[PDB]
Amino acid sequence: SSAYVDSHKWEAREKEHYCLADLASLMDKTFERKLPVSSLTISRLIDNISSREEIDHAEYYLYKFRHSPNCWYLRNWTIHTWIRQCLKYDAQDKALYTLVNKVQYGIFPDNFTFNLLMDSFIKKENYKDALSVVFEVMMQEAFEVPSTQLLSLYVLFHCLAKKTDFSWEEERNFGASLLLPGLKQKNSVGFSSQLYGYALLGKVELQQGLRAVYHNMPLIWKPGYLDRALQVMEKVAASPEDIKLCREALDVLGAVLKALTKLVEQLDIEETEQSKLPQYLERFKALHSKLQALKIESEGLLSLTTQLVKEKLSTCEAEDIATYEQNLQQWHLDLVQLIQREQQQREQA
Amino acid sequence: KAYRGGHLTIRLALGGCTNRPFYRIVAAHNKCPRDGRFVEQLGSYDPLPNSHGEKLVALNLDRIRHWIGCGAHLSKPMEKLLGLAGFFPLHPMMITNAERLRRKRAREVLLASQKT
Amino acid sequence: VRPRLIAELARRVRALREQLNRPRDSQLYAVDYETLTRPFSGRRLPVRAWADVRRESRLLQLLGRLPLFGLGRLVTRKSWLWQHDEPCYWRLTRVRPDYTAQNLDHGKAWGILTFKGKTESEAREIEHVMYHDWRLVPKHEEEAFTAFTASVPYPPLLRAMIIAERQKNGDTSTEEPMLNVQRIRMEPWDYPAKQEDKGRA
Amino acid sequence: QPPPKPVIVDKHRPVEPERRFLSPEFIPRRGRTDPLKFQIERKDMLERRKVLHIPEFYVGSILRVTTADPYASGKISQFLGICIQRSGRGLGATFILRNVIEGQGVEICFELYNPRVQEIQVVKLEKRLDDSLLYLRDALPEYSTFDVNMKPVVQEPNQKVPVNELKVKMKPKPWSKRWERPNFNIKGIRFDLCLTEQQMKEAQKWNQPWLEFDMMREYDTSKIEAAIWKEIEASKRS
Ligand SMILES: [Mg+2]
């Protein structure tokens, strides 16, 4: 969707054309006297950038703004000025570095801007960058958007193309990321991906405890992830259509390999997951048999089923475009108020 | 002595020579010394038994109620004595101490029965 | 009477200097995890919080990983939810991090709160922000998490005194005297306090 | 995590390019002598310059210097001071430094070619309208009172010389040099407060205007300094 990717409006709409060196000196002396500064200066700077060294200067000035007396304002239109200024001049190393150390820079793109970024990633045909970026979106917890289908495509493709058997950080990242795209409750793909994510989270718990499940990952503390997977399977068997894939075999493998032979966060009366493994496996076999007694093709490759989504993806992209023009109109409406605001100070002087 | 902040407190003042303590419940500020000045002398207490075997203590009910209505905090020994008296609720730490003493005495009797 | 001016001068100058160059909140909240001693103070931490300071992170460090520090996003009082099975949270309204912090991991933020599902139409300062006892709840499992549904005799001496009083008055009043206890809202320890009431070095 | 790297860029076509600057001791004195003397002493100091840098400076600049003392704490001596003047030519060229410390005004005369000195450093580069600042003795101590721990004020790589056009208050009349006369032609001081209009009228008698109008005394240099420049660049290339 080259039309969905490109947009001449942003590049040909409301350019400032001020002196980059003058703006740099102004911002430098203002941050040396460490008084607060409006986002208007950074916005005009970014709109005026036309060079790689200038984007680097802007990166350092954005770091300074993060460490400036004001940090919360976090104007999305300025964030997207920066994002375009970086991605059109092709600094993916810089984009990825900022996006991974968001705490150092604090960039937070919305649905359409992020979908543009990830579509550029598709066009350049890279996987590791997109994978790290979707992990950072898992950190964001922003999935109730038209980019949900793009996130789903990405994860469904990369979890299959990974071919990496042992990695605890990466595996926890995958297990926690496979949930949020599926909360839209759309189809077999959705709730079975939620099932597989529950399975991965329970595996991560049983192999390295519940601490990392929540410490540096926003998750729920209920240890029964296998229990929740069993609940999901039983309610699905009770209830539509369930197009299935052989990742249930991966679930079987994990369960069997865990059944194979300090601070105490677990509650005393409630049993331990180590002691629950046996009945977990018994009920898992039971639900397996019930599902096969009840859909059970396990042939349709899930990454291929994301091509079915491309059509209604091509329908919801229109809604996304419309919301983006609404955002642009709101920005152009409320931003001019801030230009007269500086005129207020200048006329007062 | 104008004490900043602070608050009035009915507490025990000590009298009598060594090995003869005589406590006096009396209202005063939180910052006053032990034997420091006071406002009104409220009551007395002798931790020693008399010729009858009992020991002595006096309470000024109406005045103490007036002081509490005016607002003054209580020290743990004096409110413990009040709770033991009955004008005041009984003390939970007193209940725990009693129960611990009874447990220890039961254990001692058990050990004596074992030895015998 | 002889006046004195250098005393006023010293008072004013000390007040101005301290309110100008007081130590930063992040500076005095920083903790070294291997020794468990705050800089600028040289004080040790309590044994009950040693492990939590070693393991768990701070509120602003948790809020730095999402946009706008998560307005309306669920952070729950780990202590409240370990002390009681009922859900307790914070309707965080306003946030302000400290610019001097490197990771922007310190600041001040508050809004409305709730204790065992008893929400108040009241947005007040939080209590104990700097602790390493903060737990972030996602946006999923949100509604399920947030879902939520006489008298005592007087003392014996006091009741005897009132009996004697009303007998001297003359009325029988065979009813046993009582007081209201449903009115007395005995509040648990963990009910929060007013940050501004407590000072700062 | 890696530390941030601050970088500053200043792009101004008129202001950035400054072309040339010569040292005051390469040039010879009006006296007559064979230029062989000058050229050999020049190549000597230049093949020493290949080692030692002498970050160029001016009168009124703040210099920090480290030198190898024979018998001292660590056998080194570190001194910060204001440049009062640069005197002499050839290798015997020196510069004066001064600083008020603990109420005492100390001053040294550093020779800038002796191996005993280890490093020169410019904490600040500036210029006073007066070429000679010897009146800082009689000036107030607060003007000369400088910090020893002041780290270098970052200066641009290529800029014009910052000139602080200021004036200075002075100690009362009992001075040593009689700075009031027009022979020195100095303006940093404040006559209006240092003396009376009567003293101005009384000192204007020593005005000898014809000194600057005369032209057989002045010393032309253009071709000379050009030849010295070419010798410098030839020695640098070789
Ligand atoms: Mg003399």
From Swiss-Prot, chain A:
Keywords (A to Z) from UniProt: Coiled coil, Cytoplasm, Mitochondrion, Repeat, Ribonucleoprotein, Ribosomal protein, RNA-binding, rRNA-binding, Transit peptide, Translation regulation, tRNA-binding
Principal location listed in the UniProt entry: cytoplasm
InterPro entries in alphabetical order: mS27/PTCD2, Pentatricopeptide_rpt, Ribosomal_mS27, TPR-like_helical_dom_sf
Transmembrane annotation, as ranges: none
PROSITE patterns: PPR
One record GO biological process: mitochondrial translation
Similarity-based family: Belongs to the mitochondrion-specific ribosomal protein mS27 family.
Protein name (database record): Small ribosomal subunit protein mS27
Curated annotation (Swiss-Prot), chain B:
UniProt keyword list: Mitochondrion, Phosphoprotein, Primary mitochondrial disease, Ribonucleoprotein, Ribosomal protein, Transit peptide
GO biological process, one term: mitochondrial translation
Transit peptide range per the UniProt entry: 1-25
Compartment list: Mitochondrion
MF GO annotations: structural constituent of ribosome
CC terms in the record's Gene Ontology section: cytosol; mitochondrial inner membrane; mitochondrial small ribosomal subunit; mitochondrion
Domain of life from the UniProt record: Eukaryota
Illness the protein is tied to: Combined oxidative phosphorylation deficiency 2: A mitochondrial disease resulting in fatal neonatal metabolic acidosis with agenesis of the corpus callosum.
Family: Belongs to the bacterial ribosomal protein bS16 family.
Subunit structure, as described in the record: Component of the mitochondrial small ribosomal subunit (mt-SSU). Mature mammalian 55S mitochondrial ribosomes consist of a small (28S) and a large (39S) subunit. The 28S small subunit contains a 12S ribosomal RNA (12S mt-rRNA) and 30 different proteins. The 39S large subunit contains a 16S rRNA (16S mt-rRNA), a copy of mitochondrial valine transfer RNA (mt-tRNA(Val)), which plays an integral structural role, and 52 different proteins. bS16m has a zinc binding site.
Descriptive protein name: Small ribosomal subunit protein bS16m
Species of origin: Homo sapiens
Organism lineage: Eukaryota, Metazoa, Chordata, Craniata, Vertebrata
Gene name in the database record: MRPS16
Residues of the full protein shown: 10 to 125 of 137
Swiss-Prot record, chain C:
Localization (cell): Mitochondrion
A GO molecular-function annotation: structural constituent of ribosome
One of the GO BP terms on file: mitochondrial translation
One Pfam assignment: MRP-S34
GO terms for cellular component: mitochondrial inner membrane; mitochondrial small ribosomal subunit; mitochondrion
Region (Disordered): 168-201
Keywords attached to this entry: Disease variant, Mitochondrion, Primary mitochondrial disease, Ribonucleoprotein, Ribosomal protein
UniProt biased composition (Basic and acidic residues): 184-200
Alphabetical list of InterPro entries matching this protein: Ribosomal_mS34
Subunit record text: Component of the mitochondrial small ribosomal subunit (mt-SSU). Mature mammalian 55S mitochondrial ribosomes consist of a small (28S) and a large (39S) subunit. The 28S small subunit contains a 12S ribosomal RNA (12S mt-rRNA) and 30 different proteins. The 39S large subunit contains a 16S rRNA (16S mt-rRNA), a copy of mitochondrial valine transfer RNA (mt-tRNA(Val)), which plays an integral structural role, and 52 different proteins.
Disease: Combined oxidative phosphorylation deficiency 32: An autosomal recessive disorder due to deficiency of mitochondrial respiratory chain complexes, I, III and IV, and characterized by delayed psychomotor development and neurodevelopmental regression. Additional variable symptoms include poor or absent speech, inability to walk, and abnormal movements.
The protein's name: Small ribosomal subunit protein mS34
Species whose genome carries this gene: Homo sapiens (Human)
Swiss-Prot record, chain D:
Phosphoserine modified-residue sites: 23
Location(s) in or outside the cell: Mitochondrion
Keyword Glycoprotein in annotation: no
GO molecular function: structural constituent of ribosome
Disulfide bridge map: none
The entry's keywords: Mitochondrion, Phosphoprotein, Ribonucleoprotein, Ribosomal protein, Transit peptide
Record-level GO BP terms: mitochondrial translation
Gene Ontology CC annotations of this record: mitochondrial inner membrane; mitochondrial large ribosomal subunit; mitochondrion; nucleus
Leader sequence segment: none
Record text on subunit structure and interactions: Component of the mitochondrial large ribosomal subunit (mt-LSU). Mature mammalian 55S mitochondrial ribosomes consist of a small (28S) and a large (39S) subunit. The 28S small subunit contains a 12S ribosomal RNA (12S mt-rRNA) and 30 different proteins. The 39S large subunit contains a 16S rRNA (16S mt-rRNA), a copy of mitochondrial valine transfer RNA (mt-tRNA(Val)), which plays an integral structural role, and 52 different proteins.
Family: Belongs to the bacterial ribosomal protein bL19 family.
Protein name as catalogued: Large ribosomal subunit protein bL19m
Lineage, top ranks: Eukaryota, Metazoa, Chordata, Craniata, Vertebrata
Gene that produces this protein: MRPL19
Shown segment, full-protein numbering: 55 to 292 of 292
